Design an enzyme around this catalytic site. Sequence first.
Site, PDB file in Angstrom:
ATOM      1  N   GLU A 232      -7.663  -1.780  -2.058  1.00 37.14           N
ATOM      2  CA  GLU A 232      -6.210  -1.736  -1.118  1.00 37.14           C
ATOM      3  C   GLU A 232      -5.840  -2.561  -1.097  1.00 37.14           C
ATOM      4  O   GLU A 232      -3.974  -2.901  -0.738  1.00 37.14           O
ATOM      5  CB  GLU A 232      -6.444  -0.184  -0.240  1.00 37.14           C
ATOM      6  CG  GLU A 232      -6.474   0.921  -0.439  1.00 37.14           C
ATOM      7  CD  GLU A 232      -5.557   1.590  -1.772  1.00 37.14           C
ATOM      8  OE1 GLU A 232      -4.224   1.182  -1.438  1.00 37.14           O
ATOM      9  OE2 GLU A 232      -5.755   2.474  -1.513  1.00 37.14           O
TER      10      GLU A 232
ATOM     11  N   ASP B 238       3.566   0.865  -3.240  1.00 36.42           N
ATOM     12  CA  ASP B 238       1.682   1.212  -4.237  1.00 36.42           C
ATOM     13  C   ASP B 238       2.212   1.313  -5.254  1.00 36.42           C
ATOM     14  O   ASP B 238       3.455   1.138  -6.027  1.00 36.42           O
ATOM     15  CB  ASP B 238       1.305   2.056  -2.790  1.00 36.42           C
ATOM     16  CG  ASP B 238       1.567   3.475  -3.332  1.00 36.42           C
ATOM     17  OD1 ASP B 238       3.168   3.806  -3.809  1.00 36.42           O
ATOM     18  OD2 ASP B 238       1.991   4.115  -2.626  1.00 36.42           O
TER      19      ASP B 238
END
EC number: 3.2.1.17
Length: 162
Positions: A11, A20
């Site tokens: 991440e 994202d």
Amino acid sequence: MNIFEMLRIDEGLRLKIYKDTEGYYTIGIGHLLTKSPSLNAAKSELDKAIGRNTNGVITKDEAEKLFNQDVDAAVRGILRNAKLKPVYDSLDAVRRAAAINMVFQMGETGVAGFTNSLRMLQQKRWDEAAVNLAKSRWYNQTPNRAKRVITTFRTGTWDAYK
């Protein structure tokens, strides 16, 4: 290696609001803020999550706090899910981390629709599970991350993370 270190690799860490891989407003260690295209809406979700007016910026401690909550939430979600729980329980600790990783990224509904992969995982048909897992939007959109998570399911080792 462990689930915290694994997700930190997958991440990253960013202290300002970013989008994202799906284009959704996110902060910290893959903490999804909202699927809304409104940055102001995202800033509101952030402030609510942190408990102060952040103006789109948080500290590393604050990022790690949300991260701990999110990992906790993903596990607790798995255990409350009637489809996921027996598969999770059948797994060893290394593969359990791979399962948490998946839920963290795609949400527990997303993962619970991997019915055929889930069955193969519970039967411990690791090579077959691995092949089935890659036949997915998940794999095509994020192949490098998916390959790491799949190797973890296939081997029950942390080799894909070093």
